[PDB]
Amino acid sequence: GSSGSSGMNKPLTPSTYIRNLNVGILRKLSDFIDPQEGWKKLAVAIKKPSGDDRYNQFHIRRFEALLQTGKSPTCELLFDWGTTNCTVGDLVDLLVQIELFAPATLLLPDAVPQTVKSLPPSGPSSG
């Protein structure tokens, strides 16, 4: 069993910068982007306005050193890319481009064309 169908509050917003996102959301993203080489896919999908590849293999090895020791490459990438000047909507956009509809939806469940969403279950226990 189980039921609920409450909702907490609205997400972040597509024009908020990546680094502005809270560490909890950075963890939630790392949950989904750390596997599947999701962060590599995001990194290499990030072009400059002109089209220059922001992050080539030279810097991918840098992020790999993180995953190879236990730092998330997701968090570092997302955090660093914040200083490049990109946003949640920038992220969603690219996340769709790499087939990463789960984290796209988590951020912005409307901005991803696949009709799929879910409520997370509920339990305000105390103690």
UniProtKB/Swiss-Prot annotation:
Sites bearing N-acetylmethionine, chain numbering: M8
Cellular compartments annotated: Cytoplasm
Domain (Death) ranges: 27-111
Summary of the knockout phenotype: Mice are strongly altered in their responses to viral and bacterial challenges due to a severe impairment of interleukin-1 and Toll-like receptor signaling pathways. Malt1 and Irak4 double knockout suggests an additional role of Irak4 in B-cell antigen receptor (BCR) mediated signaling pathway, since the double mutant inhibits B-cell proliferation.
Domain of life: Eukaryota
Record's comment on post-translational modification: Phosphorylated.
Positions carrying N6-acetyllysine: K41
Protein's job: Serine/threonine-protein kinase that plays a critical role in initiating innate immune response against foreign pathogens. Involved in Toll-like receptor (TLR) and IL-1R signaling pathways. Is rapidly recruited by MYD88 to the receptor-signaling complex upon TLR activation to form the Myddosome together with IRAK2. Phosphorylates initially IRAK1, thus stimulating the kinase activity and intensive autophosphorylation of IRAK1. Phosphorylates E3 ubiquitin ligases Pellino proteins (PELI1, PELI2 and PELI3) to promote pellino-mediated polyubiquitination of IRAK1.
Family: Belongs to the protein kinase superfamily. TKL Ser/Thr protein kinase family. Pelle subfamily.
Quaternary organization: Associates with MYD88 and IRAK2 to form a ternary complex called the Myddosome. Once phosphorylated, IRAK4 dissociates from the receptor complex and then associates with the TNF receptor-associated factor 6 (TRAF6), IRAK1, and PELI1; this intermediate complex is required for subsequent NF-kappa-B activation. Direct binding of SMAD6 to PELI1 prevents complex formation and hence negatively regulates IL1R-TLR signaling and eventually NF-kappa-B-mediated gene expression. Interacts with IL1RL1. Interacts (when phosphorylated) with IRAK1. May interact (when phosphorylated) with IRAK3.
Protein name according to UniProt: Interleukin-1 receptor-associated kinase 4
Annotated organism of origin: Mus musculus (Mouse)
Full protein: residues contained: 1 to 114 of 459
